[PDB]
Design a binder for these strands. Structure first.
Ligand SMILES: [Mg+2]
Length: 267
RNA sequence: GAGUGCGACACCUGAUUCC
DNA sequence: GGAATCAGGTGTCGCACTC
């Protein structure tokens, strides 16, 4: 389920009441629950909005209208995966959302990839990339390790990667807003001068933004796909996160380390 | 030692909808 | 009994940064 902002929750509630919806007793941690005919809408205090009952089409459209009314388009959301994992690639993804893309993300109930299973992520990423334009920078470990040699700091590397993608996408698409996770204290500073006239937002919990969340899903799916390829390529079994790393280091032939791991890590 | 942000991974428990 | 959605919480492992 997607996450509504504070203003959207309030505007959605008013809108649904204004066309007759009946308030019902909300479940634990929910803000409100409305019935419209036989369709149920539940909005959690977190902002997550959940459809229930039957004939959910009218509810879905009303939510879409609400989110569309206060979301400036076109916009870009930016996110990375594989940053803190010793094994496998670093992936930076940016998604450009126009109206058709935004409506799609809403329909899909898109949210932060951290809250999604692997199968859900792969499924959603293909739905996303079928509708939205975007750009992905993939750094498999062999490439990552070379890039890291020049930067000697992951934030500096991330800055360079984001700066290039965002600059190119802004020149091409000229969005009204650019939103990105605060991945370093210097990220705003680096991105400020490549976004042209767009409003730039660098902030924590950036995945509350639909386009940022869509980007987290794409970046994560690219990582998962690459992890599988690395496994078949080097005939090795790999953990998606940081588990069993000391043993994995010993098990893995030394000449494959630069091809599988982020060597600068101390694990 | 304690935090913040980013990246995760692995679990527990409760609620809701539909069949 | 099955599919799914949400929420509150626990632990572990990394890079960067602050006190
Ligand atoms: Mg991410």
């Amino acid at each position: 389920s997607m996450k509504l902002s504070s203003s959207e929750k309030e505007k959605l509630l008013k809108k649904l009441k204004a066309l007759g919806a009946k308030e019902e007793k909300p479940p634990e941690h929910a803000q409100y629950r409305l019935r419209l005919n036989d369709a149920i809408l539940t909005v959690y205090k977190s902002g997550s909005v959940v459809y229930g009952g039957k004939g959910r089409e009218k509810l879905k459209e009303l939510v879409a209208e609400t989110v569309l009314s206060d979301t400036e388009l076109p916009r870009i959301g930016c996110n990375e995966a594989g940053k803190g994992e010793f094994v496998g690639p670093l992936v930076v993804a940016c998604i450009v959302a126009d109206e058709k893309c935004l409506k799609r993300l809403i329909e899909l109930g898109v949210k932060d990839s951290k809250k999604l299973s692997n199968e859900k992520v792969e499924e959603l990423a293909s739905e996303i990339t079928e509708t939205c334009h975007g750009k992905v920078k993939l750094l498999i470990p062999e490439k990552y390790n070379r890039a890291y040699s020049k930067f000697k700091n992951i934030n500096r590397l991330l800055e360079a990667v984001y700066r290039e993608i965002v600059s190119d996408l802004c020149e091409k698409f000229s969005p009204k807003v650019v939103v990105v996770d605060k991945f370093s204290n210097r990220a705003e500073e680096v991105l400020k001068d490549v976004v042209k006239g767009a409003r730039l937002e660098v902030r924590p919990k950036a995945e509350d933004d639909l386009a940022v969340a869509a980007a987290s899903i794409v970046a994560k799916a690219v990582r998962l796909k690459t992890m599988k390829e690395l496994e078949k390529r080097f005939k090795v079994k790999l953990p998606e996160g940081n588990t069993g790393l000391a043993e994995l280091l010993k098990k893995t032939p030394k000449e494959l380390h630069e091809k599988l791991f982020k060597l600068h890590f101390s694990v």
